[PDB]
Write a protein that binds this ligand. Structure first.
Ligand SMILES: CCS(=O)(=O)Nc1cc(-c2cn(C)c3c(=O)[nH]ccc23)cc2c1ccn2C(C)(c1ccccn1)c1ccccn1
Length: 127
């Protein structure tokens, strides 16, 4: 099985804006998670071909990863902060669907999710 193409990260047919919360999502939230020890498996799409995971995209139909999220932020793909937060939540939940509770990769995702929720509790004031 091939890998799927990565999620779209630019779309010139969508209106674009910078906002306090989107800037925070890139410069604080994504930045903090990216530098975490456990971030590395989540910095690019799951490369099922490389990892020999023939069953991954058989069940994960909304793949998401922080590299995609970073690119989306950098390309002003998101209008609302919730659209970005939803992508982080999808990334975590994919991990909790494919892998058994308590597995290494799940424990990595849970640590990142705890940190993510902490930083989301500090989102700046909306315009
Ligand atoms: C940067 C993304 S990548 O695809 O190129 N590299 C890796 C990704 C992933 C990966 C990411 N996600 C979200 C999952 C998941 O949900 N289940 C299983 C594997 C993975 C794991 C990668 C690796 C590399 C080694 N590995 C490991 C060593 C791995 C896992 C499975 C098969 C082969 N190698 C790995 C790393 C951490 C914890 C456990 N295993």
């Amino acid at each position: 099985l091939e890998n799927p193409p990565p999620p779209e990260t630019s779309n010139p047919n969508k209106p674009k804006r910078q906002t306090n919360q989107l800037q925070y999502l890139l410069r604080v939230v994504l930045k903090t998670l990216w530098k975490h020890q456990f971030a590395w498996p989540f910095q690019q799409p799951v490369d099922a071909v490389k990892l020999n995971l023939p069953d991954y995209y058989k069940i994960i139909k909304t793949p998401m990863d922080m590299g995609t999220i970073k690119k989306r932020l950098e390309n002003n793909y998101y209008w609302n902060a919730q659209e970005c937060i939803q992508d982080f939540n999808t990334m975590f939940t994919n991990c909790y669907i494919y892998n058994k509770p308590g597995d290494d990769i799940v424990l990595m995702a849970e640590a990142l999710e705890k940190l993510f929720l902490q930083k989301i509790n500090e989102l700046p004031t909306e315009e």
